Each structure stands twice: as C-alpha cells, then as structure tokens.
Write a protein that binds this DNA or RNA. Structure first.
Ligand SMILES: [Mg+2]
Ligand SMILES: [Mg+2]
Ligand SMILES: [Mg+2]
Ligand SMILES: [Mg+2]
Ligand SMILES: [Mg+2]
Ligand SMILES: [Mg+2]
Ligand SMILES: [Mg+2]
Ligand SMILES: [Mg+2]
Ligand SMILES: [Mg+2]
Ligand SMILES: [Mg+2]
Ligand SMILES: [Mg+2]
Ligand SMILES: [Mg+2]
Ligand SMILES: [Mg+2]
Ligand SMILES: [Mg+2]
Ligand SMILES: [Mg+2]
Ligand SMILES: [Mg+2]
Ligand SMILES: [Mg+2]
Ligand SMILES: [Mg+2]
Ligand SMILES: [Mg+2]
Ligand SMILES: [Mg+2]
Ligand SMILES: [Mg+2]
Ligand SMILES: [Mg+2]
Ligand SMILES: [Mg+2]
Ligand SMILES: [Mg+2]
Ligand SMILES: [Mg+2]
Ligand SMILES: [Mg+2]
Ligand SMILES: [Mg+2]
Ligand SMILES: [Mg+2]
Ligand SMILES: [Mg+2]
Ligand SMILES: [Mg+2]
Ligand SMILES: [Mg+2]
Ligand SMILES: [Mg+2]
Ligand SMILES: [Mg+2]
Ligand SMILES: [Mg+2]
Ligand SMILES: [Mg+2]
Ligand SMILES: [Mg+2]
Length: 86
RNA sequence: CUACCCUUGGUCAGGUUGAAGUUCAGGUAACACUGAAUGGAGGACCGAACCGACUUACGUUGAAAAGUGAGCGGAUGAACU
RNA sequence: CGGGUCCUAAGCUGAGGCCGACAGGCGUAGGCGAUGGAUAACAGGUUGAUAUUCCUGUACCACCUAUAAUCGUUUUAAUCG
RNA sequence: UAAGGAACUCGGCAAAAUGACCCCGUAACUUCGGGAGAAGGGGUGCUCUUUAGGGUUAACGCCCAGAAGAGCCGCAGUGAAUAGGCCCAAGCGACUGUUUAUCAAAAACACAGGUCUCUGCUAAACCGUAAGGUGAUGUAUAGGGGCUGACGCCUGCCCGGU
RNA sequence: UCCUAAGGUAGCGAAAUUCCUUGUCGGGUAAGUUCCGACCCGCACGAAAGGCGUAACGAUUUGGGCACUGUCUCAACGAGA
RNA sequence: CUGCAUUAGCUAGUUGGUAAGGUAACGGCUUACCAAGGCAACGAUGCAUAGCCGACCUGAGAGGGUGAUCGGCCACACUGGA
RNA sequence: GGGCGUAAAGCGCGCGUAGGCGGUUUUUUAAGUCUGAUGUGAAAGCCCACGGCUCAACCGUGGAGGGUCAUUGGAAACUGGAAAACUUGAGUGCAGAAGAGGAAAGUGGAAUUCCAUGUGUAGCGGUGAAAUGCGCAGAGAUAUGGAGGAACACCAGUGGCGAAGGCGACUUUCUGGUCUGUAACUGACGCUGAUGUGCGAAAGCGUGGGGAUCAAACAGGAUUAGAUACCCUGGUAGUCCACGCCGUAAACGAUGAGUGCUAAGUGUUAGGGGGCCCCUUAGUGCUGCAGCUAACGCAUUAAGCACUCCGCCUGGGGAGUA
RNA sequence: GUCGAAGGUGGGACAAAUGAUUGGGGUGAAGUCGUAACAAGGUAGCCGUAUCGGAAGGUGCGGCUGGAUCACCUCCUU
RNA sequence: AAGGAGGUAAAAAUGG
C-alpha cells in the first residue's frame, strides 16, 4: 500500500497518538497489505514468489492476533469485528 | 404397399432415480473443500397406451397368401403416428 | 357447424424468359395448394327416418334503407385511407 | 399328481419357480455414474384401547395419515387377479439405436471418437445433354470422399512393385 | 552364410483363427471331445480390412451353481374343442 | 504393569438423567422414558502374544532376560449353558 | 554412554498446526523440587552376623535392603501457575540503497533454416582418412527481398537477487523480499516444528497451438573380428507457448533451523559514522591461530565452545525389491 | 410366556496351508558372448528422466565434480 | 616468483 494509505490506517487504528507499534495498528496494516496482494494475485495467478510474502504476512498477523487475544479479549473481539477478518 | 425425404399436425397411464447450477452452514489469507437444502438433467430406471417381433405351442386344402395364444424388447426419443 | 365467395406452407403451375435433335426441361413475376392461421349461435323440444340445419326462447356477424342526439364543410381536418 | 428332482435333451426347449408394498441388509469390480431391486432376510388379516400429527373450516364436520399396546380367527392374511427368478464365469460388440415386410436381429449396419485425403468458393463432390440445382443462403473450427469404430495403453519394419 | 523392398516389434495365442487334436498340464464332475486357467512346435494371430485390455449395456454366443418343476424315471386322472 | 499405525477412527445400553425391578452390596446391573452423549494420536478400536507377583539369571552399574521347584493372588476341572 | 562434510546418517525447499523449549526484575502460590515423622512394602529369597548338622552345601535365628508408595509438617533458589514492570529478542514508524526476485503486455539487433529472383560453374559437405547425402533439372558461393521460430554477443565480475528450484536484450504496468541509520512506537508478542499445506531443474503425460535450431527413436555411410555406439549425412517425438498433470535429480556446501561466545591478515558488493586514513553494518571470497578431526581438512560464512527443537543412522548384499 | 447354550441358514471380514504355471533374487567349477567401470579406462564418470539395443550398456535433456588435460585470457592468496 | 578459482580455444584411425 502507499505510505499515505498506511498513514491513514495507522491514524485510524492507533491506540493513542504517536502509536505505530500497537498490535491493532500492525494487524490493520497487515490486513490492508494482504488484501492488496490478494487483488494482485487474482490477476497474476502464477506469481508464487509474491504469494509467499503474502503468506508470511498472514502468519505474522495470526501471531499478533494470538498475542492480542491472550492479553485482552475485548480488544481482540473489537479489532476483528472492526476489520472483518474472522 | 414400401424406403428416404419435405411441409404441417397429433400421441406417450402411473411410478422411480436425482446431473449441472444455486442457497445456507462450516472452512480458508483467499481459493480449493465438506455437509445440508434446493434444483430437475438423461438416446436414464420400472411399467400401461402405442411401436416392435426374441422363444415357443397352435395353425400349414389356415379364422389369416405371414396369423393366433403364452411369454418377449422399446416405451422423452436416432420415439411413434 | 366443415369447405368455397379469406390466408399462406411443402409441393404443383408458370406470362415473358433460359436451355434443349423433336418431344420437351428449367424458371421470374403471378397463381394454385391444408395437414396450420383467420372467422358471427346457444339451450330446450320434436320425427319412422334430419337437426348447433326444423320448431320454441333468447343472441350474435356483415351489409342495406329511413330517421338521427352530435361533429364537418375544400391548405381542409369531420370522415376514408 | 406319490417318491425322485434335469437322471430329459443338441440345449432345462416347454413348464415350474420369482413377482405387490414396507423394513433390515447388500460383494468383486468400476470410466466413481454405477454394479443394485445385487445377494440374503423380516413383516402383511381382523378387533379393541391409548395416542404425535397434516389439509380444509368460527366451530362442528369432512379428508389424509402415523405410533404403541392388548386381543381374535384360519392350513394359509399383497388369503382372488395383476406385478423381477437369482448367482459365478468366458467369447463378441463399448453403449441407446438399425436390418434381410414373408425361414437369419446377430458378433452384421449405425454410432460418438480417431485418422487420411480432396476442396480458396461459379469450392470440391453430386443430379442434369443443357439450362437449372443440391453442396449452402454454408466458406477450411467449413464441405465431400476412404478407412477405423466409446474409453484406456498403444499402433513396430519395408517406398523394390502398384 | 544365401536371399530380400524389408524380414513380424509390443501385445496376444489349440483362439469366432490350431489341421494334427478329445494337444498337454491344472480346475470343475462319480465320470467333462464342451467350459475355465496355464503352456506355446501360431498347419495358417498381430497392431486403425487396427493389437491388447475394458466398468456399464445385450430377447447375443458359451460353461457352471441355487431355486424349481410331468423335461425325465413313468406315467395316471380330471375339464373343455 | 506389552508388541504392532503395513491397525484411525470406536461406541447405540453406548454416555448421562428420571422411575421401577434386582443384588450382601453401589452401579446401565436390567427394563421403560428423555437427551445425544462417551472413548480416542496422553494411541481409542483392531490384531498378535501372555496367567500376575514375591522372586530367579546376568551385569560394576544403569539396564537386559526369565516367571521351574517354594509362598501369595487369579483363572480353569472333556466343551458350552444353568 | 555414540553419531550424521567425505565412513551408514540433514527431508529438494518454504509456509505453518499440535507438541518441546524459551529474555531481565518484583510480589505471591507450593504442582515439580528438597527435608522430618507415622503406616505399610507378608513369609521364604539375596546381602551381613550368629547358632546347629564332624565340615560344607543345607537348616535355623536376628539384622540390613527393596516404593516411581501413602498420610502429615516444614523451605522457596530453579522449573511450573497467578499479579505487576523493562527493552536488550521480535515487529512497527521515520529517512535511505541495490538488485538477471516474480507476473503480464510491447519493442529491437545479430545469427540459423526455408522460399523467390540476378550472377556463376562442377563441385559442395564431411572426416584420422572416407563414404552416405546434396549438385550439371544448375548445387555450393554471392546479392537482394520475403516467411517464421528460438536465444539474448559485449556488459559479465569468489558480482547481484531469491527459501530452494532458479533468474541475464530493452520498454511499460502489477507485485514479493532483503540491507543500512534513527530512536518516537508495542512490550517477549520468540525459536523449532510431527501431522498438514504449497513451491520445486530436466525428462515425461493430456488438450490446443507452434516448429527455426538442435535432436532420443529411426534410416543410410564409415570404423570394427563384430559396432544395435563413439564419428559423418539426414531425421520424428521433444526442444517453444497456454492450461492442467507428474513431484523426482550428485534437488550438493554431499554440511537442518535458531541463538550466543572464541586470535588475526587481505580483497570485493550495498550502505553508514569520524578525520587518502580510521571506525562501523550486512553480505560475498581468499589466507590462517586456538580448538576440532581417522585423516583429508574446517576454522566469526566452524566441521571450535555451548543451549533449544526437528529430520535421519546402526555391517555388505537381498532392496528402495515384495 | 420372557431370557437362553447348542444347532441351522446367509453374505461378508481376517488368517494359514496348498496350486498347473510364472517372476526376479542368492550361491556355485577352469562354461559361452562381449568389455561397461577403475588411468583422460581409450566416448570423463556419476545423478534424475525418456527411449532403444543379445548383454553389459548407447543415445537425448538438465544437473554434479566425487573429472584428467596442452595454449590462452579473468581475477584471489603468500 | 609460486599456488589456488572462472571461462575458453586447436588437435584426435584401431588393438594391445
Ligand atoms: Mg430409456
Ligand atoms: Mg422391422
Ligand atoms: Mg403377442
Ligand atoms: Mg432396457
Ligand atoms: Mg419400460
Ligand atoms: Mg411460355
Ligand atoms: Mg384444416
Ligand atoms: Mg339418425
Ligand atoms: Mg410329482
Ligand atoms: Mg410331492
Ligand atoms: Mg444329461
Ligand atoms: Mg441321455
Ligand atoms: Mg423357457
Ligand atoms: Mg451392440
Ligand atoms: Mg425374415
Ligand atoms: Mg426373426
Ligand atoms: Mg469395423
Ligand atoms: Mg500400420
Ligand atoms: Mg481345451
Ligand atoms: Mg486379423
Ligand atoms: Mg492395417
Ligand atoms: Mg474392431
Ligand atoms: Mg438394443
Ligand atoms: Mg497361554
Ligand atoms: Mg556393561
Ligand atoms: Mg555417505
Ligand atoms: Mg539440505
Ligand atoms: Mg520379606
Ligand atoms: Mg520440460
Ligand atoms: Mg546424429
Ligand atoms: Mg531424493
Ligand atoms: Mg542429500
Ligand atoms: Mg564478511
Ligand atoms: Mg571401457
Ligand atoms: Mg568410458
Ligand atoms: Mg541408438
């Protein structure tokens, strides 16, 4: 995604101002990246190399989600319902 | 009459099976995928009408110059008329 | 009511036309041609023998004649087409 | 139709047997559709009691349709009639179709698929003396002819002869 | 080594093809010129006049079972023309 | 307290509840009803093998092998049921 | 109380589930962990002692032993559980770097083959030497034009990129990863990874295209004792494209991943900081201590020293067979 | 009358033995044919794959060095 | 000057 869209997403999902490393911010940006790569792959089906990075992003988001669900169930539920990633 | 064809019409009780597609649920990063429901395909299934003619008995100066009785095959199809 | 005084399909025929020893064959316009399209009447009664045909009752279609509420009266504007 | 039960016969030809509905259950193999109604079993009448339902109706009523239990009768309850016999193997043809009207229905024809070959359009092929037509109101993913004949795995060598 | 254009590959094989022949061996039967499996001295298979397989299908040809029975042992009685 | 996954699914009185019956006794032990539960990769199920132990043999030990005689516990008495 | 570079042994490589394991501090719990008491672990046996058979075996009597045992009381360092903090690991933000990383379209030059035509004559081609073959119907050579397929000369480098396989003309679009500095940001969120799920050179399979070159099969010639070859002349599949399938290679560094620690010298790729020099990060090479090794050799890109997890081995055949 | 051993009937599952015939494997004596590998083994070998051939093997494509080697350039180490 | 890595020519009868 563009740095502008990334800035918009981090502004939207940041827990507080100046927050860029929160699980919410990271997983929202990862959701955007995953969707963009999925849209790319839909046209360029045979781009296995890109799809591999996509899967790395998916696993990173999964681990962030596991950590967030372990730390704060309510935050996890709110975030997943906000992002539509369940 | 009969073969093929042309144009235009008609007919095929009843029962059965349950293709594709779709929806819902689950599932996936997304797809595959799984289940249920829905759906109603087929020179598909059983079986009358209808078409046919495998076996057999009878008939053989016949009821009939090719039939009759009992079984037999197809029966939405390259169907029958 | 079914057919004709309506329509066309396959097919048949075919002015001129094209072709061919003769005979004649082919074919355009045009015709003919239902198995299809269009198309106004029903119930009851009655005879030995016909009946949506005769009779009774009640309809409908096309056309004609007279009288007409109303509208028109020559670029028309009523009306036909 | 006693006893027997294919000993008949070219051959189980004919006959006999099976046959309906419900429930249980069902193999190899398979192109995953099937094979399958595989096979192999169980139930089936009538009376009464209790009782979940569905359609139509204000309701009553009418119609459809189960479950459980307890009883009754016969040799026998789809009490008649109508209604698959089944299985294990092998050859052939893939299959549904078609055929010698009137001794042959098949392993024959056809077939979807394969391949070869001709054909550039007034196409090739075909009918006709021709005109005129079919091909086609089509145009090489098309049209004619030959051979092969679903599908799977394959299809070797020889161009001297014709 | 002779000859040829070149000498039959895979698969299959006493076969819808095998004369000899009821080949031989194994299975099935009390007994099997048929049948099934195998062998290969293929008289005289063989790759689109296709080779070899093949689920499903068949009034197809073939061998074996269960059931069944007047087909038979071996005939008898009854009804009707 | 045992081997195998070239055994991955098993279970329908099965798992729980209610009532009754039954037993010295509790209990699905059995029956009737309701529910769909129960077990399993921490190895269920299936298959194979086996009486278990105190002990015995061996080994420096850790371990490995064995389960005669003697003692304990179990199971059986031609086979199966009562 | 062993191993896996070359002896048998690292899955071809990712992504990732269960499980195993897990950074620093504080408080708390007592499951593991440690310690005391009680009961029990029959008898016989083994071991130690004593006594009786004349000895011994043997017999007898005491002692000792044997539990991963149970109940109960105590400790809190470590592992486990609960609560609270940290930024060093791991990600994120911010500023920068290079790249044959991948996918899809388009453009281009050289060269090969073929077709047409002009000139031209008797060879061409090929080999160790030859012949098959092509060519007097005009070959080969030469000039021009056309058809079409395939690969990208120089750059090019122990160079770059990618998990591996792999990626080299140029242009555009889409897209993955990596590295450097910074210290806002989260606050252990990590490592490994059975089962699973994907990618995976070449050959090969299916359908449809395409077809220059090269070339299994195959034909001819040569060599040879023979020559089902090596060599020569042809030549089909295939080699190319799309979409599916296959899932294997000496898929190799014959070297699993992560992490830290342990002398040095010298290149090179992409960066950064301080004065051509010094320092520094990440790679990529060479040389070489300690240490390791059967040896060869490895040696901050370990095959050294250690911890975690996975895979794998246990003489050669039989056999990667049934 | 319920339960009920044995028995009967049926289609399946599993195990063992056996079977005309058939397939490779191992061992064995101076057997027959060739000579693939080890040196550059006289065509470097080997790996995966495809196909062909009496046989070892040959050939094609990609891969490896666990390959010898005369001349050349390109770098790195002492 | 001596060693390590990459590319790359030319040659070739047959049997010991
Ligand atoms: Mg039918
Ligand atoms: Mg007929
Ligand atoms: Mg009849
Ligand atoms: Mg039928
Ligand atoms: Mg029928
Ligand atoms: Mg005239
Ligand atoms: Mg009419
Ligand atoms: Mg009359
Ligand atoms: Mg009798
Ligand atoms: Mg009798
Ligand atoms: Mg007989
Ligand atoms: Mg007889
Ligand atoms: Mg009969
Ligand atoms: Mg047929
Ligand atoms: Mg006839
Ligand atoms: Mg007949
Ligand atoms: Mg034929
Ligand atoms: Mg042929
Ligand atoms: Mg015979
Ligand atoms: Mg023949
Ligand atoms: Mg032929
Ligand atoms: Mg045929
Ligand atoms: Mg038929
Ligand atoms: Mg025993
Ligand atoms: Mg020892
Ligand atoms: Mg090794
Ligand atoms: Mg490896
Ligand atoms: Mg004791
Ligand atoms: Mg390939
Ligand atoms: Mg060649
Ligand atoms: Mg391997
Ligand atoms: Mg390896
Ligand atoms: Mg370095
Ligand atoms: Mg040799
Ligand atoms: Mg060699
Ligand atoms: Mg060859």
């Amino acid at each position: 995604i563009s740095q502008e869209r990334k800035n918009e997403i981090i502004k939207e999902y940041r827990v507080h101002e100046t927050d860029t490393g929160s699980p919410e911010v990271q997983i929202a940006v990862l959701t955007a990246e995953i969707n963009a790569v999925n849209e790319h792959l839909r046209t360029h089906k045979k781009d296995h190399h890109s799809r591999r990075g996509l899967l790395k992003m998916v696993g990173r988001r999964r681990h962030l989600l596991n950590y967030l669900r372990s730390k704060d169930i309510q935050r996890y539920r709110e975030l997943i319902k906000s992002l539509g990633i369940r």
